[PDB]
């Protein structure tokens, strides 16, 4: 019933892979390019599915990965993410392994050449990583300078509550407005972040951060909107 009504699955399911999602008594199967109906999902929240990924090998369907599939939906943007629970060993055998990654980031991308030529926007939204959807993203874009900066707060893991350093709005090869910059924790480079700008009026940002931690690189999905 509400937008974003539809997300193309592209990163989330690769060609000839099969992605099954389950929630309650429903189960749906998806292949590369297929549409996920985000129209019925709650805006401004993480929607939860169980997933399994399969492929044919030597004529038999096998499992590649199982776990939880997360969707954060906004009005003009959404993003998917995977919490793996089991993954192919290396050998035709699953092994337990928990890792988190961002899947598709999509929506009505704002054109770089049609951005607001002036003014300041403040975006407020959610940062979510492994086992933690409770983080809070604040981000600010100065369209006069075409710089953005922000930060993540309230994630349970304190090393994840980083600053998103000032970075430029540039066009990518589709002429979409995107931001790529650095992440700081306590005044130290601790990774990077990426945001696209979405909505005809730059109403939303959505992307991800990769944060250096003692436990390895940790991924954070990012989405926010203006009032």
């Amino acid at each position: 019933d509400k937008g974003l009504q539809s997300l193309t699955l592209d990163q989330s399911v690769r060609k000839n892979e099969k992605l099954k999602l389950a929630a309650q008594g429903a189960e749906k199967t998806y292949g590369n390019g297929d549409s996920l109906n985000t129209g019925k999902l709650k805006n401004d929240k993480v929607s939860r599915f169980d997933f399994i990924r399969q492929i044919e090998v030597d004529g038999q369907l096998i499992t590649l990965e199982s776990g939880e599939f997360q969707v954060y939906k906004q009005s003009h943007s959404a993003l998917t993410a995977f919490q793996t629970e089991q993954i192919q060993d290396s050998s035709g055998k699953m092994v337990a392994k928990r890792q988190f990654r961002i899947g598709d980031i999509a929506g009505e991308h704002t054109s770089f050449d049609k951005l607001p030529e002036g003014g300041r926007a403040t975006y407020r939204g959610t940062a979510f990583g492994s086992d933690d959807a409770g983080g809070k993203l604040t981000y600010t874009i100065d369209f006069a300078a075409k710089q953005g900066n922000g930060k993540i707060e309230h994630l349970k893991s304190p090393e994840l509550n980083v600053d998103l350093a000032a970075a430029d709005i540039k066009p990518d090869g589709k002429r979409h407005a995107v931001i790529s910059g650095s992440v700081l924790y306590n005044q130290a480079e601790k990774g990077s972040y990426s945001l696209g700008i979405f909505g005809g009026k730059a109403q939303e940002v959505a992307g991800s951060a990769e944060v250096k931690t003692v436990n390895g690189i940790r991924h954070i999905g990012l989405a926010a909107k203006q009032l």
Partner: antibody
Amino acid sequence: EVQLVESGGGLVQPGGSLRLSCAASGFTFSSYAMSWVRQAPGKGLEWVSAISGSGGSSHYTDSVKGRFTISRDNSKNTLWLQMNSLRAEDTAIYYCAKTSGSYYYHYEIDVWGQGTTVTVSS
Amino acid sequence: EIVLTQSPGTLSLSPGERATLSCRASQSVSSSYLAWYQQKPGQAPRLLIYGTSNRATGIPDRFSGSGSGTDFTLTVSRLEPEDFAVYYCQQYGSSPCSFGQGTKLELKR
């Protein structure tokens, strides 16, 4: 070690209700789908129901679709089967079962419980 | 709602003989989603073989599995007395999950 302890079975009359419990120990509970499987006296194994590791997906044999409710508590390492409207044929030993992965199917039962007996009669 | 039909229903064999248990599906089942369980009387079932040919933790090399399509086989090359029990094949690649009706391995004397 990996242990599955069923409780809550017993004797009810037709139409009655029982709340099976299964206490999991020895593994990371939330990472594995769990199932209930039953065995009527002298007969074979019949799959009853299963629930994903996260608790977000569930499925049931049509026999108990509407009557039985599977659930779990990943904070307390507990699996439940709520059996409402019990019937004569539901009489059986009910086994808790741990599968080898998170999805509610595509994984084998790698651990079985001891079984809790359910009897439905007058 | 695949139907698994195990044959024979009862199999009477001497220790040290070779046992061939058969499981026939009503449609093709992927090798990745077929297992065998052993159940001794007054005991819960136990996983034996998973994914058609993979022995589980604590199952002897004596036990072996094979198959593909609609036809699967469990083999006990040389039967120990401990192997005389009921065997169940199960498919877990489609919903609802299904178990065959069992094959009882009797100790001939």
